[PDB]
PDB file of C-alpha atoms in Angstrom:
ATOM      1  CA  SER V   5      -1.052 -40.940 -21.489  1.00  0.00           C
ATOM      2  CA  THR V   6      -0.320 -44.638 -20.075  1.00  0.00           C
ATOM      3  CA  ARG V   7      -2.288 -47.808 -20.003  1.00  0.00           C
ATOM      4  CA  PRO V   8      -2.095 -49.731 -16.703  1.00  0.00           C
ATOM      5  CA  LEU V   9      -0.741 -53.256 -16.995  1.00  0.00           C
ATOM      6  CA  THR V  10      -2.231 -55.541 -14.291  1.00  0.00           C
ATOM      7  CA  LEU V  11       0.252 -58.470 -13.760  1.00  0.00           C
ATOM      8  CA  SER V  12      -1.994 -61.245 -13.015  1.00  0.00           C
ATOM      9  CA  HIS V  13      -0.248 -64.033 -11.090  1.00  0.00           C
ATOM     10  CA  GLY V  14      -2.974 -65.933  -9.395  1.00  0.00           C
ATOM     11  CA  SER V  15      -3.850 -64.448  -6.140  1.00  0.00           C
ATOM     12  CA  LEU V  16      -0.639 -62.083  -6.076  1.00  0.00           C
ATOM     13  CA  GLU V  17      -1.316 -58.979  -8.135  1.00  0.00           C
ATOM     14  CA  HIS V  18       0.543 -55.784  -9.005  1.00  0.00           C
ATOM     15  CA  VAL V  19      -0.496 -53.284 -11.652  1.00  0.00           C
ATOM     16  CA  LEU V  20       2.091 -51.705 -14.005  1.00  0.00           C
ATOM     17  CA  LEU V  21       1.495 -48.208 -15.391  1.00  0.00           C
ATOM     18  CA  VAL V  22       2.679 -48.590 -18.987  1.00  0.00           C
ATOM     19  CA  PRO V  23       2.636 -45.825 -21.672  1.00  0.00           C
ATOM     20  CA  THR V  24       0.765 -46.676 -24.729  1.00  0.00           C
ATOM     21  CA  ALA V  25       3.892 -46.255 -26.873  1.00  0.00           C
ATOM     22  CA  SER V  26       5.232 -49.501 -25.578  1.00  0.00           C
ATOM     23  CA  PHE V  27       2.000 -50.988 -24.025  1.00  0.00           C
ATOM     24  CA  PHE V  28       1.679 -53.146 -27.239  1.00  0.00           C
ATOM     25  CA  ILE V  29       5.008 -54.711 -26.298  1.00  0.00           C
ATOM     26  CA  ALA V  30       4.533 -54.904 -22.544  1.00  0.00           C
ATOM     27  CA  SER V  31       1.173 -56.520 -23.235  1.00  0.00           C
ATOM     28  CA  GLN V  32       3.001 -59.311 -25.102  1.00  0.00           C
ATOM     29  CA  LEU V  33       5.309 -60.191 -22.319  1.00  0.00           C
ATOM     30  CA  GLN V  34       2.681 -60.540 -19.728  1.00  0.00           C
ATOM     31  CA  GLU V  35       1.011 -63.108 -22.177  1.00  0.00           C
ATOM     32  CA  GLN V  36       4.114 -65.132 -21.974  1.00  0.00           C
ATOM     33  CA  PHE V  37       4.614 -64.794 -18.230  1.00  0.00           C
ATOM     34  CA  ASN V  38       1.265 -66.519 -17.426  1.00  0.00           C
ATOM     35  CA  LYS V  39       2.686 -69.328 -19.606  1.00  0.00           C
ATOM     36  CA  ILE V  40       5.942 -69.389 -17.584  1.00  0.00           C
ATOM     37  CA  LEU V  41       4.779 -69.205 -14.142  1.00  0.00           C
ATOM     38  CA  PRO V  42       3.230 -72.343 -12.731  1.00  0.00           C
ATOM     39  CA  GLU V  43      -0.218 -72.505 -11.272  1.00  0.00           C
ATOM     40  CA  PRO V  44      -0.817 -70.953  -7.935  1.00  0.00           C
ATOM     41  CA  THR V  45      -0.136 -73.394  -5.105  1.00  0.00           C
ATOM     42  CA  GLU V  46      -1.529 -73.054  -1.753  1.00  0.00           C
ATOM     43  CA  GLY V  47      -1.097 -69.290  -1.725  1.00  0.00           C
ATOM     44  CA  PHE V  48       2.195 -69.340  -3.661  1.00  0.00           C
ATOM     45  CA  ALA V  49       4.099 -71.269  -1.056  1.00  0.00           C
ATOM     46  CA  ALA V  50       5.794 -73.264  -3.852  1.00  0.00           C
ATOM     47  CA  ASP V  51       9.463 -73.414  -4.727  1.00  0.00           C
ATOM     48  CA  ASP V  52       9.147 -70.655  -7.240  1.00  0.00           C
ATOM     49  CA  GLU V  53       5.613 -69.195  -6.946  1.00  0.00           C
ATOM     50  CA  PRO V  54       5.714 -65.525  -5.877  1.00  0.00           C
ATOM     51  CA  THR V  55       4.574 -65.154  -2.360  1.00  0.00           C
ATOM     52  CA  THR V  56       4.814 -61.422  -2.232  1.00  0.00           C
ATOM     53  CA  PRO V  57       4.083 -58.759  -4.856  1.00  0.00           C
ATOM     54  CA  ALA V  58       7.711 -57.921  -4.784  1.00  0.00           C
ATOM     55  CA  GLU V  59       8.999 -61.029  -6.456  1.00  0.00           C
ATOM     56  CA  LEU V  60       5.935 -61.038  -8.644  1.00  0.00           C
ATOM     57  CA  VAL V  61       7.616 -58.526 -10.813  1.00  0.00           C
ATOM     58  CA  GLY V  62      11.133 -59.545  -9.673  1.00  0.00           C
ATOM     59  CA  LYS V  63      10.985 -62.618 -11.672  1.00  0.00           C
ATOM     60  CA  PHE V  64       9.204 -60.356 -14.167  1.00  0.00           C
ATOM     61  CA  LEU V  65      12.399 -58.325 -14.178  1.00  0.00           C
ATOM     62  CA  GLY V  66      14.303 -61.632 -14.957  1.00  0.00           C
ATOM     63  CA  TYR V  67      12.544 -62.981 -17.948  1.00  0.00           C
ATOM     64  CA  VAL V  68      12.294 -59.722 -19.615  1.00  0.00           C
ATOM     65  CA  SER V  69      16.011 -59.364 -18.959  1.00  0.00           C
ATOM     66  CA  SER V  70      16.507 -62.765 -20.518  1.00  0.00           C
ATOM     67  CA  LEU V  71      15.031 -61.506 -23.790  1.00  0.00           C
ATOM     68  CA  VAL V  72      17.695 -58.645 -23.971  1.00  0.00           C
ATOM     69  CA  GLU V  73      21.117 -58.392 -25.353  1.00  0.00           C
ATOM     70  CA  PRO V  74      23.198 -55.725 -23.809  1.00  0.00           C
ATOM     71  CA  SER V  75      25.305 -55.146 -26.998  1.00  0.00           C
ATOM     72  CA  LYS V  76      22.256 -54.384 -29.258  1.00  0.00           C
ATOM     73  CA  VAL V  77      19.385 -51.963 -28.821  1.00  0.00           C
ATOM     74  CA  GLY V  78      16.068 -53.730 -28.909  1.00  0.00           C
ATOM     75  CA  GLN V  79      12.380 -52.985 -28.091  1.00  0.00           C
ATOM     76  CA  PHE V  80      12.393 -54.729 -24.745  1.00  0.00           C
ATOM     77  CA  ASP V  81      14.873 -52.584 -22.940  1.00  0.00           C
ATOM     78  CA  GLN V  82      12.236 -49.872 -23.215  1.00  0.00           C
ATOM     79  CA  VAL V  83      10.034 -51.980 -20.961  1.00  0.00           C
ATOM     80  CA  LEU V  84      13.140 -53.227 -19.046  1.00  0.00           C
ATOM     81  CA  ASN V  85      13.919 -49.890 -17.335  1.00  0.00           C
ATOM     82  CA  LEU V  86      10.239 -49.077 -17.363  1.00  0.00           C
ATOM     83  CA  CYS V  87       9.275 -51.926 -14.981  1.00  0.00           C
ATOM     84  CA  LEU V  88      12.655 -51.403 -13.261  1.00  0.00           C
ATOM     85  CA  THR V  89      11.781 -47.811 -12.206  1.00  0.00           C
ATOM     86  CA  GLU V  90       8.409 -48.875 -10.924  1.00  0.00           C
ATOM     87  CA  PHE V  91       9.956 -51.812  -8.959  1.00  0.00           C
ATOM     88  CA  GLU V  92      12.550 -49.674  -7.303  1.00  0.00           C
ATOM     89  CA  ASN V  93      10.089 -46.943  -6.610  1.00  0.00           C
ATOM     90  CA  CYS V  94       7.239 -49.096  -5.346  1.00  0.00           C
ATOM     91  CA  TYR V  95       8.897 -51.988  -3.467  1.00  0.00           C
ATOM     92  CA  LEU V  96      12.322 -50.593  -2.805  1.00  0.00           C
ATOM     93  CA  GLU V  97      12.637 -47.232  -0.759  1.00  0.00           C
ATOM     94  CA  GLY V  98      15.911 -45.857  -1.594  1.00  0.00           C
ATOM     95  CA  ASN V  99      17.622 -48.675   0.078  1.00  0.00           C
ATOM     96  CA  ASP V 100      19.531 -51.622  -1.507  1.00  0.00           C
ATOM     97  CA  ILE V 101      17.831 -54.675  -2.752  1.00  0.00           C
ATOM     98  CA  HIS V 102      19.525 -56.494  -0.003  1.00  0.00           C
ATOM     99  CA  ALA V 103      17.526 -54.774   2.678  1.00  0.00           C
ATOM    100  CA  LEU V 104      14.372 -55.541   0.710  1.00  0.00           C
ATOM    101  CA  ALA V 105      15.294 -59.136   0.560  1.00  0.00           C
ATOM    102  CA  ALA V 106      16.305 -59.383   4.091  1.00  0.00           C
ATOM    103  CA  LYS V 107      13.120 -57.745   5.362  1.00  0.00           C
ATOM    104  CA  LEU V 108      10.824 -59.666   3.062  1.00  0.00           C
ATOM    105  CA  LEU V 109      12.482 -62.689   4.661  1.00  0.00           C
ATOM    106  CA  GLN V 110      11.955 -61.095   8.086  1.00  0.00           C
ATOM    107  CA  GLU V 111       8.317 -59.947   8.161  1.00  0.00           C
ATOM    108  CA  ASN V 112       6.697 -62.236   5.454  1.00  0.00           C
ATOM    109  CA  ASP V 113       7.321 -65.907   4.814  1.00  0.00           C
ATOM    110  CA  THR V 114      10.978 -66.989   4.545  1.00  0.00           C
ATOM    111  CA  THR V 115      12.050 -68.982   1.568  1.00  0.00           C
ATOM    112  CA  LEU V 116      15.572 -67.927   1.233  1.00  0.00           C
ATOM    113  CA  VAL V 117      15.988 -69.449  -2.215  1.00  0.00           C
ATOM    114  CA  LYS V 118      13.448 -66.997  -3.611  1.00  0.00           C
ATOM    115  CA  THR V 119      14.796 -64.160  -1.662  1.00  0.00           C
ATOM    116  CA  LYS V 120      18.203 -64.609  -3.215  1.00  0.00           C
ATOM    117  CA  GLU V 121      16.590 -65.104  -6.597  1.00  0.00           C
ATOM    118  CA  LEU V 122      15.261 -61.547  -6.092  1.00  0.00           C
ATOM    119  CA  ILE V 123      18.746 -60.047  -6.002  1.00  0.00           C
ATOM    120  CA  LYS V 124      19.897 -62.488  -8.671  1.00  0.00           C
ATOM    121  CA  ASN V 125      17.324 -61.362 -11.400  1.00  0.00           C
ATOM    122  CA  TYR V 126      17.199 -57.786 -10.211  1.00  0.00           C
ATOM    123  CA  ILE V 127      20.902 -57.062 -10.594  1.00  0.00           C
ATOM    124  CA  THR V 128      20.728 -58.711 -14.005  1.00  0.00           C
ATOM    125  CA  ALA V 129      17.879 -56.477 -15.021  1.00  0.00           C
ATOM    126  CA  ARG V 130      19.443 -53.533 -13.323  1.00  0.00           C
ATOM    127  CA  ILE V 131      22.828 -53.726 -15.008  1.00  0.00           C
ATOM    128  CA  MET V 132      21.652 -55.327 -18.234  1.00  0.00           C
ATOM    129  CA  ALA V 133      19.338 -52.158 -18.586  1.00  0.00           C
ATOM    130  CA  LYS V 134      22.625 -50.271 -19.013  1.00  0.00           C
ATOM    131  CA  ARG V 135      21.934 -48.895 -15.414  1.00  0.00           C
ATOM    132  CA  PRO V 136      25.362 -49.549 -13.722  1.00  0.00           C
ATOM    133  CA  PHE V 137      26.056 -49.126 -10.113  1.00  0.00           C
ATOM    134  CA  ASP V 138      28.460 -46.313 -11.012  1.00  0.00           C
ATOM    135  CA  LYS V 139      26.759 -44.184  -8.337  1.00  0.00           C
ATOM    136  CA  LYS V 140      27.693 -44.589  -4.644  1.00  0.00           C
ATOM    137  CA  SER V 141      24.748 -44.784  -2.241  1.00  0.00           C
ATOM    138  CA  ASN V 142      24.646 -43.464   1.230  1.00  0.00           C
ATOM    139  CA  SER V 143      24.890 -46.651   2.992  1.00  0.00           C
ATOM    140  CA  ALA V 144      24.738 -45.463   6.595  1.00  0.00           C
ATOM    141  CA  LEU V 145      27.789 -47.159   7.952  1.00  0.00           C
ATOM    142  CA  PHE V 146      30.045 -46.296   5.129  1.00  0.00           C
ATOM    143  CA  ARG V 147      29.032 -42.601   5.173  1.00  0.00           C
ATOM    144  CA  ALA V 148      29.389 -42.871   8.925  1.00  0.00           C
ATOM    145  CA  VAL V 149      33.009 -44.068   8.438  1.00  0.00           C
ATOM    146  CA  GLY V 150      33.506 -41.302   6.028  1.00  0.00           C
ATOM    147  CA  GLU V 151      32.261 -38.784   8.467  1.00  0.00           C
ATOM    148  CA  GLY V 152      34.215 -40.443  11.275  1.00  0.00           C
ATOM    149  CA  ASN V 153      31.280 -41.763  13.124  1.00  0.00           C
ATOM    150  CA  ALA V 154      32.722 -45.356  12.848  1.00  0.00           C
ATOM    151  CA  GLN V 155      35.541 -47.264  11.667  1.00  0.00           C
ATOM    152  CA  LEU V 156      35.934 -50.621   9.776  1.00  0.00           C
ATOM    153  CA  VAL V 157      38.313 -53.525   9.514  1.00  0.00           C
ATOM    154  CA  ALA V 158      37.957 -56.290   6.984  1.00  0.00           C
ATOM    155  CA  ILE V 159      38.755 -59.783   8.139  1.00  0.00           C
ATOM    156  CA  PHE V 160      39.074 -62.814   5.993  1.00  0.00           C
TER     157      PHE V 160
END
Protein backbone atom coordinates (compact mmCIF):
# COMPACT_ATOMS: atom_id res chain seq x y z
CA SER A 1 0.00 0.00 0.00
CA THR A 2 2.60 2.51 1.17
CA ARG A 3 6.40 2.66 1.04
CA PRO A 4 8.17 4.00 4.15
CA LEU A 5 10.42 7.01 3.61
CA THR A 6 13.25 7.19 6.15
CA LEU A 7 14.23 10.85 6.55
CA SER A 8 17.98 10.46 7.01
CA HIS A 9 19.39 13.47 8.87
CA GLY A 10 22.73 12.31 10.26
CA SER A 11 22.02 10.90 13.71
CA LEU A 12 18.46 12.26 13.88
CA GLU A 13 16.00 9.96 12.14
CA HIS A 14 12.29 9.74 11.43
CA VAL A 15 10.53 7.43 8.96
CA LEU A 16 7.73 8.70 6.72
CA LEU A 17 5.03 6.26 5.65
CA VAL A 18 4.46 7.35 2.05
CA PRO A 19 1.95 5.79 -0.36
CA THR A 20 3.46 4.53 -3.60
CA ALA A 21 1.27 6.82 -5.75
CA SER A 22 3.42 9.74 -4.57
CA PHE A 23 6.51 7.91 -3.27
CA PHE A 24 8.29 8.79 -6.51
CA ILE A 25 7.79 12.47 -5.67
CA ALA A 26 8.51 12.26 -1.94
CA SER A 27 11.65 10.30 -2.75
CA GLN A 28 12.82 13.22 -4.89
CA LEU A 29 12.48 15.77 -2.10
CA GLN A 30 14.48 13.80 0.46
CA GLU A 31 17.18 13.63 -2.22
CA GLN A 32 17.27 17.43 -2.08
CA PHE A 33 16.93 17.80 1.69
CA ASN A 34 20.19 15.99 2.37
CA LYS A 35 21.77 18.58 0.06
CA ILE A 36 20.15 21.46 1.96
CA LEU A 37 20.85 20.29 5.47
CA PRO A 38 24.47 20.85 6.54
CA GLU A 39 26.49 18.10 7.99
CA PRO A 40 25.72 16.82 11.50
CA THR A 41 27.52 18.92 14.12
CA GLU A 42 28.24 17.58 17.64
CA GLY A 43 24.87 15.88 17.71
CA PHE A 44 23.01 18.66 15.88
CA ALA A 45 23.79 21.38 18.43
CA ALA A 46 24.38 23.79 15.53
CA ASP A 47 22.37 26.89 14.66
CA ASP A 48 20.03 25.01 12.29
CA GLU A 49 20.80 21.31 12.66
CA PRO A 50 17.73 19.42 13.92
CA THR A 51 18.40 18.37 17.50
CA THR A 52 15.15 16.46 17.92
CA PRO A 53 13.17 14.40 15.37
CA ALA A 54 10.36 16.94 15.58
CA GLU A 55 12.17 19.75 13.78
CA LEU A 56 13.79 17.15 11.54
CA VAL A 57 10.48 17.08 9.71
CA GLY A 58 9.61 20.61 10.82
CA LYS A 59 12.21 22.05 8.47
CA PHE A 60 11.06 19.33 6.09
CA LEU A 61 7.62 20.94 6.29
CA GLY A 62 9.25 24.21 5.27
CA TYR A 63 11.24 23.43 2.15
CA VAL A 64 8.38 21.39 0.74
CA SER A 65 6.12 24.37 1.42
CA SER A 66 8.69 26.56 -0.31
CA LEU A 67 8.15 24.58 -3.52
CA VAL A 68 4.37 25.18 -3.40
CA GLU A 69 2.25 27.94 -4.83
CA PRO A 70 -1.11 28.25 -3.03
CA SER A 71 -2.94 29.57 -6.10
CA LYS A 72 -2.05 26.64 -8.38
CA VAL A 73 -2.54 22.96 -7.72
CA GLY A 74 0.69 21.03 -8.08
CA GLN A 75 2.25 17.68 -7.22
CA PHE A 76 3.98 18.67 -3.97
CA ASP A 77 0.77 19.60 -2.17
CA GLN A 78 0.06 15.87 -2.18
CA VAL A 79 3.13 15.24 -0.05
CA LEU A 80 2.61 18.52 1.81
CA ASN A 81 -0.55 17.48 3.66
CA LEU A 82 0.86 13.94 3.64
CA CYS A 83 3.82 14.83 5.83
CA LEU A 84 1.66 17.36 7.69
CA THR A 85 -0.75 14.70 8.96
CA GLU A 86 2.16 12.52 10.08
CA PHE A 87 3.85 15.41 11.88
CA GLU A 88 0.71 16.53 13.69
CA ASN A 89 -0.17 12.95 14.60
CA CYS A 90 3.29 11.78 15.65
CA TYR A 91 4.87 14.77 17.38
CA LEU A 92 1.78 16.86 18.08
CA GLU A 93 -0.83 15.39 20.41
CA GLY A 94 -3.98 17.35 19.56
CA ASN A 95 -2.47 20.42 21.23
CA ASP A 96 -1.15 23.50 19.49
CA ILE A 97 2.33 23.72 17.95
CA HIS A 98 3.10 26.28 20.68
CA ALA A 99 2.83 23.59 23.34
CA LEU A 100 5.15 21.35 21.34
CA ALA A 101 7.68 24.13 20.90
CA ALA A 102 7.58 25.24 24.54
CA LYS A 103 7.96 21.69 25.83
CA LEU A 104 10.69 20.72 23.38
CA LEU A 105 12.38 23.82 24.79
CA GLN A 106 11.56 22.54 28.28
CA GLU A 107 12.69 18.91 28.33
CA ASN A 108 15.23 18.78 25.52
CA ASP A 109 17.93 21.31 24.69
CA THR A 110 16.88 24.95 24.39
CA THR A 111 17.71 26.85 21.20
CA LEU A 112 14.84 29.27 21.04
CA VAL A 113 15.63 30.31 17.47
CA LYS A 114 14.97 26.78 16.24
CA THR A 115 11.91 26.40 18.44
CA LYS A 116 10.37 29.48 16.84
CA GLU A 117 11.47 28.32 13.39
CA LEU A 118 9.32 25.30 14.17
CA ILE A 119 6.14 27.32 14.40
CA LYS A 120 7.28 29.52 11.51
CA ASN A 121 7.61 26.79 8.90
CA TYR A 122 4.79 24.69 10.36
CA ILE A 123 2.17 27.41 10.04
CA THR A 124 3.32 28.17 6.50
CA ALA A 125 3.02 24.50 5.65
CA ARG A 126 -0.26 24.19 7.55
CA ILE A 127 -1.98 27.18 5.94
CA MET A 128 -0.27 26.85 2.56
CA ALA A 129 -1.61 23.28 2.30
CA LYS A 130 -5.08 24.85 2.14
CA ARG A 131 -5.56 23.74 5.74
CA PRO A 132 -6.68 26.95 7.43
CA PHE A 133 -7.25 27.41 11.14
CA ASP A 134 -10.99 27.83 10.51
CA LYS A 135 -11.71 25.31 13.24
CA LYS A 136 -11.63 26.35 16.87
CA SER A 137 -9.64 24.17 19.24
CA ASN A 138 -10.58 23.34 22.82
CA SER A 139 -7.86 25.40 24.42
CA ALA A 140 -8.55 24.68 28.07
CA LEU A 141 -8.70 28.26 29.31
CA PHE A 142 -10.91 29.60 26.56
CA ARG A 143 -13.43 26.80 26.87
CA ALA A 144 -13.12 27.32 30.62
CA VAL A 145 -14.19 30.93 30.13
CA GLY A 146 -16.96 29.85 27.78
CA GLU A 147 -18.18 27.50 30.48
CA GLY A 148 -17.67 30.06 33.23
CA ASN A 149 -14.72 28.36 34.85
CA ALA A 150 -12.60 31.51 34.48
CA GLN A 151 -12.62 35.04 33.09
CA LEU A 152 -10.14 37.02 31.01
CA VAL A 153 -9.07 40.61 30.50
CA ALA A 154 -6.66 41.76 27.80
CA ILE A 155 -4.17 44.39 28.83
CA PHE A 156 -1.84 46.21 26.46
